[PDB]
């Protein structure tokens with residue numbers, strides 16, 4: 214294997230002697246050379262572990278490093294300042310100052326210019342982080358909501374131009390907001406030029422996808438593949454018009470890229486560098502689990518998938534240090550956490566906490582949540598969870614069966630209950646969700662619907678507003694970067710017309726992708742409305758989180774409340790949080806509170822609470838007590 218010094222000398226061979234002397238004395242080359250020294254051994258090691266003695270590895274690597282240098286050279290000086298800042302502040306992601314939001318540009322603001330016009334609202338809300346849903350060109354009609362990408366470079370013209378996107382990112386940065394976008398690197402649309410040219414037999418795109426002559430290998434693979442959208446097709450493959458079969462983990466119009474071809478890694482690393490130099494701060498690594506395949510396995514979470522992501526990480530450390538990764542792994546918690554590492558994905562979605570928030574609202578019992586917060590919350594140094602309540606996707610019940618079994622809970626039976634409960638097929642349920650991907654072969658099902666729909670706001674359940682507050686309080690205070698599904702902060706309900714659009718009617722996730730509700734946002738400062746009640750209470754929690762250092766960092770210790778309905782945990786040995794998941798009043802006894810200070814200020818309600826007597830919480834009440 215080559216060394217960084219050898220490879221650097223060859224990078225420079227493209228220059229005339231006169232040009233080269235100038236480059237070698239330059240600040241950019243000095244920084245690039247330093248980062249090569251520090252980070253190239255990781256890049257080489259990870260790529261070696263995946264591709265081994267492949268003839269194409271060294272030529273690909275040299276091509277990639279040449280691109281990395283050109284990319285860093287071209288990179289804007291303002292971005293190079295963020296590179297340095299984050300290179301010397303790896304824990305910026307862990308600051309209590311960070312609060313994120315996510316929205317669709319079209320649904321929330323019409324187009325990119327409209328989105329730029331909403332930036333003052335984002336500042337008003339206190340956001341420091343904004344994830345914009347897939348922005349680039351995609352098939353007309355059905356595109357999995359933009360996740361079938363036809364071009365990584367050309368903006369969806371319904372949203373505007375690449376110039377509009379540049380103005381948005383600059384305007385976000387001006388407003389103190391990180392720009393977060395998707396890196397959809399497991400698959401492209403079937404209309405992507407790479408896909409068309411690969412299928413057409415263009416030798417330049419040979420082996421860019423997984424294409425088979427018949428069902429022989431697809432049948433073998435399907436013995437062990439999980440079905441993500443069983444409504445759409447069985448197993449992991451779809452048939453082309455010419456009779457061949459292509460790997461399609463997701464929709465039939467999403468073709469899995471073939472990372473066993475090192476030139477595919479190179480191609481996507483080039484796409485990553487392009488996004489980096491737009492000034493993107495965080496790339497959401499979509500479908501991380503699926504980027505390596507192996508017969509006889511689930512073709513999820515394989516060692517090479519992790520190694521490739523670590524290879525991508527090294528490329529950013531070399532050529533765009535400001536760019537961090539957010540892993541999307543929605544799976545068993547033992548597998549979710551493996552993507553999170555300073556050298557892999559520095560942050561990642563926390564589906565366990567999210568799913569168990571909803572679980573706890575249904576059961577009223579904090580057992581599973583307490584277990585998760587006790588044993589699966591704390592992370593390695595320089596990493597963080599992204600804690601959330603809802604997303605653009607369905608809710609999957611991804612708690613661990615093994616964990617549940619310790620508590621005497623059958624995972625299978627419990628999921629059957631949660632699914633009935635949240636689609637209003639259980640006596641007395643307050644939830645108004647919609648099924649998503651019921652799989653008759655496994656009994657698995659997921660849930661669609663907005664936060665407000667799932668807590669009972671559609672039917673004006675008097676507890677709905679407080680339920681929303683409780684859920685978000687936990688995401689905001691457990692430690693990690695909280696992510697608001699924009700629209701939730703004014704109680705936005707389902708798009709009840711989603712099923713009438715023939716492009717959407719077989720995908721119930723569209724139920725919880727409503728447009729910006731002008732009527733609700735107009736009432737956000739009106740305490741007489743649900744919208745204003747939700748907004749003011751969420752905004753207050755955001756303000757407290759961001760201003761109070763007791764929330765800093767990602768670590769917590771749970772507190773045994775001795776009440777099966779009340780969750781408790783402590784931040785920085787200084788903030789004691791209680792959340793009541795019962796619709797009835799619930800007490801923490803004076804006996805349970807004996808070790809605490811005599812009195813404590815509650816940041817939620819603003820009163821001084823006596824801890825030497827029984828503490829009774831109203832239904833769904835949250836308390837944030839300063840105990841140091």
Ligand SMILES: OC[C@H]1O[C@@](CO)(O[C@H]2O[C@H](CO)[C@@H](O)[C@H](O)[C@H]2O)[C@@H](O)[C@@H]1O
Nearest residue numbers: 222225226227228229230231232233234
């Ligand atoms: O200065 C480096 C050293 O590289 C040698 C070739 O062995 O020339 C290479 O570097 C030049 C300057 O970048 C290139 O113009 C040339 O094409 C490349 O072969 C020497 O010529 C040079 O001294």
Ligand SMILES: OC[C@H]1O[C@@](CO)(O[C@H]2O[C@H](CO)[C@@H](O)[C@H](O)[C@H]2O)[C@@H](O)[C@@H]1O
Nearest residue numbers: 444647648649650651718719720721722
């Ligand atoms: O049920 C409403 C609506 O949802 C769509 C597709 O998302 O199907 C979902 O609901 C069906 C009924 O339970 C499930 O069989 C299916 O798996 C689920 O995705 C439509 O098919 C349906 O009309």
Ligand SMILES: OC[C@H]1O[C@H](O)[C@H](O)[C@@H](O)[C@@H]1O
Nearest residue numbers: 576622623626627628630631
């Ligand atoms: O009927 C309600 C019960 O159904 C299931 O058994 C669930 O596992 C349990 O949590 C719930 O209380």
Ligand SMILES: OC[C@H]1O[C@](O)(CO)[C@@H](O)[C@@H]1O
Nearest residue numbers: 305341342386388389390391
């Ligand atoms: O760490 C400081 C951070 O605060 C922000 O404004 C919000 O993310 C970032 O743009 C900046 O890098």
Ligand SMILES: OC[C@H]1O[C@](O)(CO)[C@@H](O)[C@@H]1O
Nearest residue numbers: 810811812813814839840841
């Ligand atoms: O740090 C918080 C501490 O400060 C006080 O208000 C006064 O000492 C205590 O009641 C409280 O425990």
